[PDB]
Design a protein around this ligand. Sequence first.
Ligand code: SF4
Ligand code: SF4
Ligand code: SF4
Ligand code: SF4
Ligand code: FES
Ligand SMILES: [K+]
Ligand SMILES: [Zn+2]
Lengths: 53, 263, 115, 209, 129, 211, 95, 96, 176, 115
Amino acid sequence: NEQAYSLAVEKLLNIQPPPRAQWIRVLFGEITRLLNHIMAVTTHALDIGAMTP
Amino acid sequence: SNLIEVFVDGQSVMVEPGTTVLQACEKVGMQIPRFCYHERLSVAGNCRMCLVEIEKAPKVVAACAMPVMKGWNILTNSEKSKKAREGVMEFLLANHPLDCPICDQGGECDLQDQSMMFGSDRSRFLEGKRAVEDKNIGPLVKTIMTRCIQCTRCIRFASEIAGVDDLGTTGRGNDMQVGTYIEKMFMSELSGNIIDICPVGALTSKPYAFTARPWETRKTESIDVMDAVGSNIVVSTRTGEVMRILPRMHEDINEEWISDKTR
Amino acid sequence: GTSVKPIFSRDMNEAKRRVRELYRAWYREVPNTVHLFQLDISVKQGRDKVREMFMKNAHVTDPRVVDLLVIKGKMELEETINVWKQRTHIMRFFHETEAPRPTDFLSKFYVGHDP
Amino acid sequence: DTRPTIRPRNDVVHKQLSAFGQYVAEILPKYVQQVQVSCFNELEIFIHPDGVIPVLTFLRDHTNAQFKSLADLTAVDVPTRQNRFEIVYNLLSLRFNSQIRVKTYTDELTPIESSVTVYKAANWYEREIWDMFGVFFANHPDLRRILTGYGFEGHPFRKDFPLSGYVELRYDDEVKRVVAEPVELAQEFRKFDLNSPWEAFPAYRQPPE
Amino acid sequence: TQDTQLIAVDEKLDITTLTGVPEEHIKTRKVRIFVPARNNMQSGVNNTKKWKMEFDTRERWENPLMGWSSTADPLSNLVLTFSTKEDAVAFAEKNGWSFDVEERKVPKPKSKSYGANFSWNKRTRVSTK
Amino acid sequence: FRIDELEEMLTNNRIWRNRTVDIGVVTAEDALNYGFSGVMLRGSGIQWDLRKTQPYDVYDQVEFDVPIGSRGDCYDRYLCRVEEMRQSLRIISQCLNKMPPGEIKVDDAKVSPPKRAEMKTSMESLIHHFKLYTEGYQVPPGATYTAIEAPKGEFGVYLVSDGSSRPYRCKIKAPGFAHLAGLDKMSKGHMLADVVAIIGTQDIVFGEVDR
Amino acid sequence: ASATRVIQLLRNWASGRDLQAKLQLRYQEISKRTQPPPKLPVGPSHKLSNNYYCTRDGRREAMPPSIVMSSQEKKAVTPAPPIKRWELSKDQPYL
Amino acid sequence: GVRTSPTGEKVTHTGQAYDDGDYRRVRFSDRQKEVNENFAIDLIAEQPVSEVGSRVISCDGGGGALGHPRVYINLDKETKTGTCGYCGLQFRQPHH
Amino acid sequence: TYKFVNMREPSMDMKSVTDRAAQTLLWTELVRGLGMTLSYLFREPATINYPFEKGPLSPRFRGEHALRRYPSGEERCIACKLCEAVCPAQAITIEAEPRADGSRRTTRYDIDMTKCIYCGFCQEACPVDAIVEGPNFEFSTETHEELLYNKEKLLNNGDKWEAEIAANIQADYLYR
Amino acid sequence: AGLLKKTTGLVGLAVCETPHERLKILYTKILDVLGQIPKNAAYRKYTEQITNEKLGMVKAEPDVKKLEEQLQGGQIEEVILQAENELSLARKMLRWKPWEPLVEEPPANQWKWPI
Ligand code: SF4
Ligand code: SF4
Ligand code: SF4
Ligand code: SF4
Ligand code: FES
Ligand SMILES: [K+]
Ligand SMILES: [Zn+2]
């Protein structure tokens, strides 16, 4: 969500992030992807009745 | 008639001759930067922040005291104009003490605000900054004179509006101070307005010092009852109480200044 | 100038027509909501509470605004019968907890320095 | 990028959507008052209240637009204009990877025919606007309160409803339920008058009045 | 030009009962439309270009525990800004608040003369520099 | 390694299949025209992803493959979810091994706060830091909606700038609101014990919708 | 990890996989909790010359939304060239 | 340095002192008043005054970047020995 | 680029159908779940013995506040009022009037824990690193009033979590 | 040519074993309704340009695969479905007649930012 808000304000400001900062954001952006899908699959499995996953 | 037309950044204005560039850029709504100029007060042309570029001019001209005439296309967003503002501002900012957190002008400082609209983001300064001692000319005015930018607004205000000829700039070179040499007790009943004309925190109201910051004071427009003029004043309110009183503008009433006991 | 687009009304007649069966729907609504939501206030209490709320929206003279009150009005009855709302929602109009705001000049003067 | 601070600008995208803006303008010049491209390469369409169905249907099935992904619908309520509620849609086209913004204007009383025929996505992007802002869209399947308390009055996201609102909840012993009352704050939300008295951007300068 | 079962009403536009504001906040209020007065400390005037509408200050009492600013005036946070005043009157009447007006005070032109500071018989001859 | 067991005892488990297949089936055009975003598009066979079609940030250099499936039911989206973690692992790998050197913030004190060491030595740094934490940078007027491929879906924010240092209005576009907008059809044709599985695959979280 | 070989061989059979190679509980291979001080790089515009703000003022180099028409042979122009197919996963096409 | 009130409530550096009739003092009964005994007002009264010698001193606050934004203090008022506003540390000239 | 997931085209040969029929008839994917779970059982757990041991943290951890002081004991706070000018929840209230020795330092520094967000904007906003996010988090209280902090509470925590905070800020000022 | 598409890759979107002929008959159908709208309209001025254009490509090349590249519309079923809603879009603006100038000009300061 920080990613969306950042580039949004970057777009209006006509300022681009430094190349280094661009690469950290995608690193944590995909960690959130790991964060989200881990919650997504298991809560689904939790809703079904799967506990161990 | 005598009205003379000028290409103000393109668009033409039939300004009345003898009018300066500053008194012309506001016609379309452009506010030229300034520190030493005050419209209600005389003109000195010292801070060099109004400095603007005239088309085909060999050097940028001090727009503060430039009597304009026909033609003479000014350039607002020109590179030479930006070059002048960028250089001059960091010259002000060079020896300015790092007092923004402790300075009451924080949040209502021109030098602070002008530096975020037309100003650099860092300094090439690596030498030392000059430092001058404080002064004691009143229990109301508080002097941090290292913050002074020598715009001489107080002097021209004192000797033209308050009528007291005691402020001045002692010395020359760069270590000169806008002080009073001999210790003095500022007596004028319009002394409180000296606070509101200084563009920096060099001159500040002692009672209000370290009591509030501009971004939290809700301003309400009201009048004065101390004198039978009904001075249009601004009442600063915060948490069910009033901190400091500012002068409004109405021309016939107090104009741009208020007497001391009103403040 | 006066040219405005409708939603449900052209003349006050049909505008007052909409609030007619809006009352009709609300008039027959009181007997079921009080019993089904398990209140303490009486049936006629609810009926007059519906009644008075009509009188609050009576000083408007624009067919253009009344229908907006009608759709807002018709945006609540279904929320009651279909047990969408709750006891704290439908007894809220039965303004009960709050103290009675003073009305005469002296009592307002005594309570505080406000209009 | 010789200037890493600034965001690099693109022109091949700039003129192409500029051309497409003319394309849509010619196709149905009945409703498009004006089209504005952006330095952010986000072209926007400014339509008329009756024009909601035509343009939205047009971008949906046209062979050169194919804009069929409804991104969002919202209001930008502006008190200073007579049409305070500024209803704006965002459309996405997968085939030509572009995003179209269509903007309308409306008063508190004027309706807008529902876009559920164009996109059923609007079904809930319609309800909250009626709740959050108060503007009512005609011929919509349902106009229910979706993002407020039950029996809530007014419209919060307007520039009239204050931040704290008017009503506050609390559980009371006498009634054995959480009842309402006029709002009272332990702390008043302080004011931060932070708009500088110095002009920021000469480019976006408002024309003199 | 356009007509779809056209409605023609002469009554002044008023939401009031539909905007949901309470009665004491529609009858016992005061709204003064004006141009923000610039802080005299700051020479810039990028605040005297709009029209701001807000309401009357109400009771502010210190919270017994710790010294807060407890208030019960919901209608004090609104600082609605307007491009002009003819829309400000429109906004006041459509809600029916107690309309008040303040005139957008104009800077009296202050034609200067740097040469006047150096006169030969005029009192404008500056003694300060 | 930790993904394998998540796959091993769910993907192969016939119990997980019958409780997740042939439920929440969404046809391609209905998914697209219901405003759905992200996996619903990916699950239902539609080839579309923000991270690839309009690669924001620095997603240009990275390379991977999004898992579009065939049916699009809650089971198919489950494989898309699991495979996305596997895909995200490689994306982590590609940025990790070639992280470029440089600054963490734009060299623009008017938009990025000056460094702490720079704060206590430079007069401009104090001024810029002072006003940045009182009012902040003034954003030029305009409006954008630009969205990213959040793992929930197409997540975007639509802010309008008033030309000052404060936003005017930022509509919080969320994948979940579009996700849940089609719930009426989504639970159609199925009973309670399996539409709860439809709730799970929809990845609904009550901070994007209710805000 | 502690666990003798009989435990390790037992779970390696039940899992059918080598759990010993990569375990889910971090061990001394992680970086030391105390780390040497950093010396992060200087700004990309840290040069004290030829670095005036007039050349890189990003917020100030934004123009108002450019108008192309207002109320107050023509080729079929598409907002972007229509997107094409991507590829079929050279690494692993079909699970 | 702390001084005790007649009712026993240790006054803070700001000077707050709930009197006998202040009903809100009951918040303090059956509990304890929280006072920082270290009274920052008097921790500079005893602090040694630096005899560094020059017309202007660069007061950084010690610890380099861990102190306060460094300020230049002028030593020309022999009556008042210069104090950094950030610090409160006392600086004097060697009799000019 | 993309890859499919569901499609499998299970071969209908005699051998392949035998495996599918065997899997259904004598369950094999389910016993795989048993094997995976049992392998999980014979593995030491990851639980931490609180409070006898507590999980790791970072030098940047943001917890209960504390108003620090200079080497000689002076309050670092000067009531520049930057912290509440950026406090997203307006949890900071500050007033300043004269101090005895000519100074006019602060009197009120109340960060309402029940309002605070622990974002850490305050410590970054402070130019003299007066207010900081301390490492402590075990300050749960049974009264709402306790979490309402005041100036004295802040200063006491500054004197309590002092050595730890000083080491953290010494180990982190290069990053900031 | 090519063997029948096992699956179009989009659920709900089935297969069609008659690609070119079905595209053609639908294409003359949208040519038909294009007649009723006036030629001078920019609609008709632009649709017939792409009508005669890609009616030629489908007519000239009959193969499924080569047609896919020439029209960049995915599978044929996507294209004919895409052309199908073009027909429906043609019908709607047949009755709409959006060729006359603006219904009415916008209010004076309705647009323009900032306020
Ligand atoms: S005068 Fe302005 S720049 Fe100088 S210290 Fe005060 S606020 Fe800062
Ligand atoms: S004291 Fe203030 S008004 Fe006087 S010259 Fe210095 S900055 Fe200007
Ligand atoms: S904590 Fe820091 S930022 Fe906040 S008032 Fe004190 S000195 Fe200023
Ligand atoms: S950490 Fe808490 S007190 Fe500090 S700025 Fe954030 S919300 Fe305010
Ligand atoms: S503005 Fe002319 S010199 Fe100050
Ligand atoms: K001043
Ligand atoms: Zn110091």
